[PDB]
Design an enzyme around this catalytic site. Structure first.
Site: not given
Ligand SMILES: O=C(O)c1cc(=O)[nH]c(=O)[nH]1
Ligand SMILES: O=C(O)c1cc(=O)[nH]c(=O)[nH]1
Lengths: 213, 207
Positions: A103, A105
């Site tokens: 990801k 984030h």
């Protein structure tokens, strides 16, 4: 075979996962049967599938600390097997699976679920050429865990590209045991039970003669 | 609240899924609490998680033909919810999920009235992408079921859940809401400081 193994074959037939016909496998061979675990595609099918995996796992007696399923087909299998171990075997096991890319984030890297540590039981459906296991093994090794075993639905007991079967290749390459809920030998035995399956029996036995290990 | 809601809060606290402290949310806001469904990471946690989702689904009364989970977090959630529907509610539902890298679907054909299941909604990105896929298959959106509705503003007047509901004319349901969390914490003298901080967050960002 054990009752749960006969029940598993009956289940696979009932849900049209185990089919007969003329199939072209990933290898290019023409096979008279095919096991398409992707057709366990409803909640009841998942519930029972996890129960059968869990029964095979406990029956094997192999000790393990964590269940790992490879993205994508392994994710539902590991999930439902973990659930069934808790609901039907008084075992509350960590699970884990991978994401193909990190990801943007956060710092989860490529793993989802519990930390990938200890003796890992890898779950899979049907080993054809070992690619999902390879990707998984690289991840297991990179995290310092060991491979306690590989748990699959069906061992087709047939040659790979060379002399040994794909399962035997995984066993040698990764120095592990592959646990299967059922084998080709069990399928043949089941097909001996009713005259209505006799044509399938002859076809499957002929295939084993040509390609079986 | 309903018993399954109280039990879900207690269970989330006991598995550190619901935690207190200082967190930076995807919006950048500093929140005193965080709900991380990814910490339901053992077989018992997964078993109960699916039961709680299944209970909220049947409680809602929404009719649906298929359960869809967005990759990746939604995959185990949809799986265990589907299991619990079958094992504990006598309901055998098709399930489906996508491959995130984008054929692109695993499981049953994407048809009919689809119930999405997710953990939380922050900005609506997983739903937007999942709705693209669902509508492209001719299917409709029966609803979205999430664990927790944080009942806070999005970028503007309305919440991210309200954006979803209006953008897609779909129903969003939640196992619990922030209001339920506050009602629970009000009962626990030892959680009084957490309660105060959550209430102050709600004053600033609550919708
Ligand atoms: O391609 C194969 O060999 C193969 C794949 C699969 O999923 N199932 C099967 O029985 N064989
Ligand atoms: O707003 C977020 O980023 C957020 C909040 C929360 O409680 N849980 C989560 O997964 N994300």
């Amino acid at each position: 075979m054990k009752p749960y193994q006969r029940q598993f074959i009956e289940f696979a037939l009932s849900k049209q996962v185990l089919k007969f016909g003329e199939f072209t496998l990933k290898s290019g061979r023409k096979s008279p049967y095919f096991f398409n675990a992707g057709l366990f595609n409803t909640g009841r099918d998942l519930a029972l599938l996890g129960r059968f995996y869990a029964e095979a796992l406990v029956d094997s007696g192999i000790e393990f600390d964590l269940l790992f399923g490879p993205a994508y087909k392994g994710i539902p299998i590991a999930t439902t097997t973990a659930v069934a171990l808790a609901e039907h075997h008084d075992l509350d096991l960590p699970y884990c699976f991978n994401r193909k890319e990190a990801k943007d984030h956060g710092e989860g890297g490529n793993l989802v679920g519990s930390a990938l540590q200890g003796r890992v039981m890898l779950v899979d459906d049907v080993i054809t050429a070992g690619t999902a296991i390879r990707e998984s093994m690289e991840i297991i090794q990179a995290n310092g865990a060991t491979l306690a075993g590989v748990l699959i639905s069906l061992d087709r007991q047939e040659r790979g590209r060379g002399e040994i079967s794909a399962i035997q290749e995984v066993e040698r390459d990764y120095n592990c045991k592959v646990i299967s809920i059922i084998t080709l030998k069990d399928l043949i035995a089941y097909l001996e039970e009713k005259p209505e399956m006799a044509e399938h029996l002859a076809a499957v036995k002929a295939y084993r003669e040509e390609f079986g290990v």
